[PDB]
Design a protein around this ligand. Sequence first.
Ligand SMILES: C/C=C(/C)C(=O)O[C@H]1C(C)=C2[C@H]([C@@H]1OC(=O)CCCCCCC)[C@@](C)(OC(C)=O)C[C@H](OC(=O)CCC)[C@@]1(O)[C@H]2OC(=O)[C@@]1(C)O
Ligand code: NA
Lengths: 49, 397, 50, 50
Amino acid sequence: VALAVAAIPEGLPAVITTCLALGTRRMAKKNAIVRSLPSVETLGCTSVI
Amino acid sequence: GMLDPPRKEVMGSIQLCRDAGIRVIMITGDNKGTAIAICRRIGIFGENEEVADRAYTGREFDDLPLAEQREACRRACCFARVEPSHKSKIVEYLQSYDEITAMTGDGVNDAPALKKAEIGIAMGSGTAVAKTASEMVLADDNFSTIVAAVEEGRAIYNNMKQFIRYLISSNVGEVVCIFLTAALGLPEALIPVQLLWVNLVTDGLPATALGFNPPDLDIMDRPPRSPKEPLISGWLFFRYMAIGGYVGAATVGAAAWWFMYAEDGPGVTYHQLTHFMQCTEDHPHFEGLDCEIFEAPEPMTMALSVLVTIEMCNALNSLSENQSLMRMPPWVNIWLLGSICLSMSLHFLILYVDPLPMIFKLKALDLTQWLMVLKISLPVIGLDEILKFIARNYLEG
Amino acid sequence: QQKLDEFGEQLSKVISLICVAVWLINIGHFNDPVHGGSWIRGAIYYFKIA
Amino acid sequence: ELVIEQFEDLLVRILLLAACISFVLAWFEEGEETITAFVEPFVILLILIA
Ligand SMILES: C/C=C(/C)C(=O)O[C@H]1C(C)=C2[C@H]([C@@H]1OC(=O)CCCCCCC)[C@@](C)(OC(C)=O)C[C@H](OC(=O)CCC)[C@@]1(O)[C@H]2OC(=O)[C@@]1(C)O
Ligand code: NA
């Protein structure tokens, strides 16, 4: 259980959500309402519109 | 003579997308003739460009042999007299090249393509169907908003990339530690209850702070990142591979140190600490002291302290990938500093506030003790600082 | 005289303390490889305020 | 159905398994410090539920 807990980054998902949530509120200011948090990452990766 | 005119910002926005290496394809239910004319007015096609093989009606596209259809999608920028299906189909072909594709629309005839695309973008003044079928909505119907969202998207990902590597790099060192003591016969240098606190609070704040690192300037002057780009590979793998071993030996070391060279509980300087198990059983062996000296919360506090101190250092090393702190100072991200301070202040709290160290099985350490931790932790900065130097020189950059 | 000699011994330390401090106040100069900051020109500046 | 999908992730499961294993080893320890032994099981659980 020590190796398990030591290998798995328990807080990663909480850091991601917080980042994305705060990033979305920032985008809303830019007039871009995001209905899907996971999309923020994929957008910057867009090569074709 | 009348026409349905393009929005004012459109042409400019198309140019910016182009500068960022992003292509724009028009997919419309309107006729080919006006679809091309609008494409010329907004800069998708040149004023006198030949578009015979760059513009198709949905039927013309359908007639192309199954092979050439896919290629046409990489070459053509205008599709007209299209049905709802044609849009999702075109999007699908684009995705067949492993391209991250976005779709912008306002009609219910766009719903299928908005669903199929990785990023469906609906107009603020468009239909509800389009909106509910999208990942994003342009509250101001402005195409420039797309570009700004792309820039934000790129910036956010560069930061996520950092704290991801950060938190995950930490987990590497922790595993090494747990494995060292396991095969080195040494006693528990770090219990799970301690690790959880480090991977949730100690490193939690630092990670979050990294999410607010300053974005690069040429971010929108670079092409799109490959979707298959691994977060950690190559020199960064070995680099993090090394940083992990260090933290694994610095923790297991600062723990064994107290058990041998510390002026608080000396032990077998011949590494017989490995048999701490055979104490209560065969006491008269080579002991001569209480066997509860191994379950002492002093050495573990030494291990954790090193871990925590190292991480805070690796947090400043996460501000940049291959840039020395001399180039990009630690104060570039004020939130990171306030972050490290909040973690350390919470470390002293988990040691002094009695109701805590008893739970985490810890015990505060004196000045001389900390001066030790700062001699096995701080050097980690110079360590990685060197590895970076080797990349931006001996390597590509 | 002992008081004046003492002042002198302390003064020499303060000056040095400053000359070293000023050197730290300008460390970012190792991030600009332009010809406008050759070793000679910059050195003159420290030996100028020294 | 939404909840069940929150526990589909591999790591969340491994972390859950470690929780139960940690809970079993909890009932096997001296009574001098048992009040501060079931912390790991609960913490690792409070997170997964969070
Ligand atoms: C979390 C901690 C540890 C130690 C872990 O097991 O991580 C490995 C692992 C699974 C990967 C590795 C770790 O590999 C090693 O440390 C090599 C084996 C030696 C371990 C022996 C123990 C003493 C990552 C963590 O680390 C380093 C330092 O090399 C980098 C990377 O991960 C990423 O890019 C993150 C993607 C979210 C992955 O190679 C990754 O595997 C993948 O598929 C990837 C592509 O992902
Ligand atoms: Na979609």
